[PDB]
Structure 1
Amino acid sequence: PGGVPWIAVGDETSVTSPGALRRMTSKDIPETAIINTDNSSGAVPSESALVPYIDEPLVVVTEHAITNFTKAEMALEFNREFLDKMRVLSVSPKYSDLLTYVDCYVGVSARQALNNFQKQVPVITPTRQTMYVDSIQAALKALEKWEIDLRVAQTLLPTNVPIGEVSCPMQSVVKLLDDQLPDDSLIRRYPKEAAVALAKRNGGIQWMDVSEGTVMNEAVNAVAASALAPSASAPPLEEKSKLTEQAMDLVTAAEPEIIASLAPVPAPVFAIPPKPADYNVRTLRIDEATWLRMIPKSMNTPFQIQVTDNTGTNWHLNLRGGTRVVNLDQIAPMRFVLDLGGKSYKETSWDPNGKKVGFIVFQSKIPFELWTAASQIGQATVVNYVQLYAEDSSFTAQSIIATTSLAYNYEPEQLNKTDPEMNYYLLATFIDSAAITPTNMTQPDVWDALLTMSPLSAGEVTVKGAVVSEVVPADLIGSYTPESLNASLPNDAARCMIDRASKIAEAIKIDDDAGPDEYSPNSVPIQGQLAISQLETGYGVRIFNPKGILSKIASRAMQAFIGDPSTIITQAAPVLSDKNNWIALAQGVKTSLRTKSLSAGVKTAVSKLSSSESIQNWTQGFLDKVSAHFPAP
């Protein structure tokens, strides 16, 4: 059981009686007080004036805790000899001797306890439990260097073999250890204790008793070693079970229901931690990127404007046809970083060296495409700016711009977004405290650079460059072209979908070892859907393929999915563009994993066995060399 012990304050006791139980304290059971403890460890002082007399609560100890703390004691007991040398814990802790067995009501709450009366319930006090744990911790703190040195001694030379047997003269092994052990090792100072400890740990190290002349296995972990050992024609149960466990954890994290839902799914639920993305605005195609706007290349009359910064200083910038801006709305909180390193921006009457470039934000009701005069800019503000420097490049008589890290954070909440007919635009170009003659500088902007965008939130998702509060995962399948995916924003739902499907891919690869054109339990779900679809009635010429061809097609599709996860969202993919196939695979993977029974592939098993035999041969050769170079008397 678990919880705390209770006593009945009144004669009436029913499963729902009001106010009938009260906590059991140390006064009710005197032998749980600290004054009556078993001071074999010596923690409690023997002076009467140093022991307090106060009431303490009681808690119930469970069998899981009992067993695990006993195993913790055995952890300490593995190194008794060095403990005896250091004169620590002459008497074993024996957790069972700190518990008192009582018959009472047990439960977390009084209502539960009223229905649960048990006999021989172990109880303890927090102070005694702390004392026990403290003793164990003190001993473990003591055994630190001994543990390290023993591990070093074991790992200096091969002590375990994957399969089979190896042997070497023990005198030769001891001579090699004496030659190669460090100077400060405790093993040199205390050989006998190390020998006994290693005999306990490993069943392959056996010492002869000189009095009786007998050798014998002395290990204490045969049961665990049996499960850790590879049987003939089979890999270890530990390895198989652990691999299956990891695969199931991967699928659980991948969350098939969410990744295969046919119904709308909330954006905060669907979203996952994103990653930054890189772009070059100047080389983008506006027909493919929906978050860019550009002045048409027909206005043909550059005009000068003046803007002020937060500090209140004034700057001048020129706007001409072909200028590009980013539509700040509908893109969620974001962080922009611009780098101009490696570009030239050199003109006959313009020297970039020593000039300043900055980010400018515009707010206006007039759409950007109709801007022809300064009156139409609205409210403009310079957010950040940096000065530039030029250095010679590989090309002769060519000076390029040093690296830059211009940064800005778009946070929509800081802006006043109540008015629906308001537009937000972001611009990057040359700025100056003096008027810039349009003929001198003719570049529309400085967007020919490297732009890195990082999402500033993980609760919003975008599709095709616009935010959506709601997402349908299954309907994204086979709806993206490569250029659309390239031009997609960092927080696009496609990237999250790919990242989630990557876990499924890893789980399948862990579970599977099938070669080319071989059917698999993770590949037949697609085959079933194909078989049904080819019989389904529709429009077009019908082609009939047998089960062998269908299985080969399904295996190829599965291999393609494992090789590249983006194929599911890529448009016109051979087989993985069908939502039925995607859902069938997603559902089938979970059942395939759950129906396994401690199994491994035949190919994997035979390969593992061959590799283990090769390693055994290598170990035997090394031990032969050691014996040859350290002769026994």
Structure 2
Amino acid sequence: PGGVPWIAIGDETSVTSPGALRRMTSKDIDEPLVVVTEHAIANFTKAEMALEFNREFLDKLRVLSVSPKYSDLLTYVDCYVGVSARQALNNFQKQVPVITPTRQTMYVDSIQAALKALEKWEIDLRVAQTLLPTNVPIGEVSCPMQSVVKLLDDQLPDDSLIRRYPKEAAVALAKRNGGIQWMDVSEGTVMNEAVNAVAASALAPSASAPPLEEKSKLTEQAMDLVTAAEPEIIASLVPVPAPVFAIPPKPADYNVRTLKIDEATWLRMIPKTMGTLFQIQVTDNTGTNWHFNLRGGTRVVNLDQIAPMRFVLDLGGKSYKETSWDPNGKKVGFIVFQSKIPFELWTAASQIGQATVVNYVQLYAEDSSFTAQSIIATTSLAYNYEPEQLNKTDPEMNYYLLATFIDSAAITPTNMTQPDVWDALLTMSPLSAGEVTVKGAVVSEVVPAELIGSYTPESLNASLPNDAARCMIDRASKIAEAIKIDDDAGPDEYSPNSVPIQGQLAISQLETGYGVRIFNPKGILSKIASRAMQAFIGDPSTIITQAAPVLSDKNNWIALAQGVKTSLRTKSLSAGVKTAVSKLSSSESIQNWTQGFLDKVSTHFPAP
């Protein structure tokens, strides 16, 4: 039963309009009055049963021997009943169980106090169960009870009260587990007295089959995984908003000096062989001006369009030692320029436009265990790039990122010849969570089907940490895991989730398309479909990888994704025979090992 008590606002037994009704009050019988659910009553009853499970310790504690009996508190009455006034006006009810919250609280507090008091006995009882094996993998085994007692007495806790109170522990163990047997000395009677025994036999797995509940649970978990993956999103053929498609990104490290300009569209560089060299000066946050020289081959990250990004650089163990340059004790910084002039075209400092020195550190160099090898001390040079902090308005304004040793005074060009210090190990942390990259560009939305099989290994490797392909691969790996949970078919073994792929391949060959037509036998297509599904599960990143042999078709991909979900939808308590038989064989062998151990115990713990 559910709802709250409603009493006539004004005239008793003549109520017609909602205006005529009001919430019935405690003063009408002013504490709360609530309808008691049968389900709650049954659960409290189960709670009392757990208390009876722990009854021996509480009695030995000489405290609260009387059981709570929650059913006593219930009060059933005929009246208008509803969660809202409307229901009660249309819902008069009879004998509704009712109680005040405060009384329920007192009852629960008493139960909680009881559990806290019984805390030690249950732990000691579990210790008694774990002292020796208390359960058998299959069937049952038995041994000399006096020999069993000898072993228990030998390993029993020294301070255990059970050493003074064995019988209560014996009753408790007999209550939870059917196998342990304590004969009644008075009648010499022995029989299972447990009331959980029937339930245990009901919930035991069959002689050759695992429990039905396990199959249902696994299938439900697989469906939850598929729902979390979002098959419609992964297999989407229409544009998907970047926030909807994207998932949390992960950091990536790069060496800018070693990057290939034919791979990265996010970097700009001054042409080499130009012989260009010019020193430039930039103020720091304290207003100190710092001067450094720019030369051909100097490269910069093109900040515009890359989103807010945090960069941390570690040069530890590097050399960078020059004929007139020693990195030891040097100072380095990250340089960011803001100007309308392209960096590659820069020949003078003014084309750098707005620049500020905001960060620098003093370097340390040392010599390695290998002779003639010098090691730079570990560094953590960090630059935070906020495009919003720049607040770019003028499109002409171009943003460039540089990392180089920084000095307040223009450097003698002969002393330091490097175009930049980008030959360093860089750790990048995105400062943007709203930008994703597709086809070399940040995207507000993407086509997942187009995403399928659209990246070469080189392109994916060059991709930034915010790349859509990486997010797609993570979603694909979740789907592959879900498909593998749903299908236990081996490679080259057909399944309800692979045959649709075989059908798609057959339809594709039949379809009038382009190129040399061929007919493939159904069995071969079926084997290929099984292999394709296994390959997808093994390497979900293949889905955005170019040249997928069979998974390349977005329609094939959709069919497979939909098929696994449907298999879960129409599946009822499915199971695998091979695993169950292996478990039974293992259980029997373990039982044999246990029986041998018990025989050894009987020899080493002979009954007195």
User: What TM-score range do you get, normalising by the shorter chain?
Assistant: over 0.9
Give me the whole-angstrom Cα distance separating, in 2, the residues matched to 1:370 and 1:215: 99
Query: Deviations for 1:493-528, whole angstroms, at most 9, x for unmatched residues?
Result: 112212122222222222333223111222222112
1:58 maps to what in 2?
A: 33
Q: Secondary structure at the match of 1:384?
A: coil
Give me the whole-angstrom Cα distance separating, in 2, the residues matched to 1:12 and 1:480: 77
Q: Secondary structure at the match of 1:127?
A: helix
Give me the whole-angstrom Cα distance separating, in 2, the residues matched to 1:296 and 1:258: 44
Aligned-pair distance for 1:231? 1.0
Q: Secondary structure at the match of 2:357?
A: strand
Query: Deviations for 1:293-344, whole angstroms, at most 9, x for unmatched residues?
Result: 1111143121111112222222222211111111222222322111112211
Aligned-pair distance for 1:14? 11
Matched, 1:262 2:237: yes
8 Å Cα contact 1:356-1:430 kept in structure 2: yes
Aligned-pair distance for 1:183? 2.2
The farther-off stretch of 225-234 and 533-542 is 225-234
Query: Deviations for 1:603-628, whole angstroms, at most 9, x for unmatched residues?
Result: 22322222222222222222222222
Aligned-pair distance for 1:117? 1.9
Aligned-pair distance for 1:16? 9.2
Aligned-pair distance for 1:430? 0.7
8 Å Cα contact 2:216-2:572 kept in structure 1: no
Distance 1:173 1:241, change over 3 A: farther
8 Å Cα contact 2:209-2:577 kept in structure 1: no
Distance 1:333 1:219, change over 3 A: farther
8 Å Cα contact 2:315-2:379 kept in structure 1: yes
8 Å Cα contact 1:279-1:451 kept in structure 2: yes
Give me the whole-angstrom Cα distance separating, in 2, the residues matched to 1:538 and 1:133: 73
Distance 1:416 1:109, change over 3 A: same
Distance 1:127 1:317, change over 3 A: same
Distance 1:178 1:113, change over 3 A: same
Give me the whole-angstrom Cα distance separating, in 1, the residues matched to 2:391 and 2:16: 58
Aligned-pair distance for 1:565? 0.9
8 Å Cα contact 2:281-2:408 kept in structure 1: no
Aligned-pair distance for 1:279? 1.7
8 Å Cα contact 2:255-2:425 kept in structure 1: yes
Aligned-pair distance for 1:417? 2.1
Aligned-pair distance for 1:267? 1.7
Aligned-pair distance for 1:227? 4.3
Distance 1:298 1:516, change over 3 A: same
The farther-off stretch of 614-623 and 345-354 is 614-623
Task: Using structure 1 for the length normalisation, give the TM-score.
Answer: 0.92
Give me the whole-angstrom Cα distance separating, in 2, the residues matched to 1:162 and 1:270: 47
Give me the whole-angstrom Cα distance separating, in 1, the residues matched to 2:466 and 2:173: 56
| Structure 1 spans left out of the alignment, 5+ residues | 29-54
The farther-off stretch of 370-379 and 143-152 is 143-152
8 Å Cα contact 1:307-1:380 kept in structure 2: yes
Distance 1:398 1:14, change over 3 A: farther
Give me the whole-angstrom Cα distance separating, in 2, the residues matched to 1:511 and 1:613: 29
8 Å Cα contact 2:238-2:447 kept in structure 1: yes
8 Å Cα contact 2:176-2:197 kept in structure 1: no
Query: Deviations for 1:166-208, whole angstroms, at most 9, x for unmatched residues?
Result: 2222222222122123323333232111111111111111211
8 Å Cα contact 2:275-2:296 kept in structure 1: yes
- 2:580 is matched with which residue: 593, 602, 605? 605
Give me the whole-angstrom Cα distance separating, in 2, the residues matched to 1:19 and 1:581: 62
The farther-off stretch of 170-179 and 16-25 is 16-25
Distance 1:249 1:224, change over 3 A: farther
Task: Using structure 2 for the length normalisation, give the TM-score.
Answer: 0.96
Aligned-pair distance for 1:85? 1.5
Distance 1:474 1:398, change over 3 A: same
Query: Deviations for 1:386-429, whole angstroms, at most 9, x for unmatched residues?
Result: 21111211331221211112222222222222223321111100
8 Å Cα contact 2:501-2:560 kept in structure 1: yes
Query: Deviations for 1:191-244, whole angstroms, at most 9, x for unmatched residues?
Result: 111111111111111211111111011222234423442212212223322222
Distance 1:475 1:89, change over 3 A: farther
Give me the whole-angstrom Cα distance separating, in 1, the residues matched to 2:422 and 2:143: 72
Give me the whole-angstrom Cα distance separating, in 2, the residues matched to 1:281 and 1:163: 63
Aligned-residue Cα RMSD (Å) equals 2.0
Give me the whole-angstrom Cα distance separating, in 2, the residues matched to 1:221 and 1:275: 51
8 Å Cα contact 1:16-1:111 kept in structure 2: no
8 Å Cα contact 1:465-1:489 kept in structure 2: no
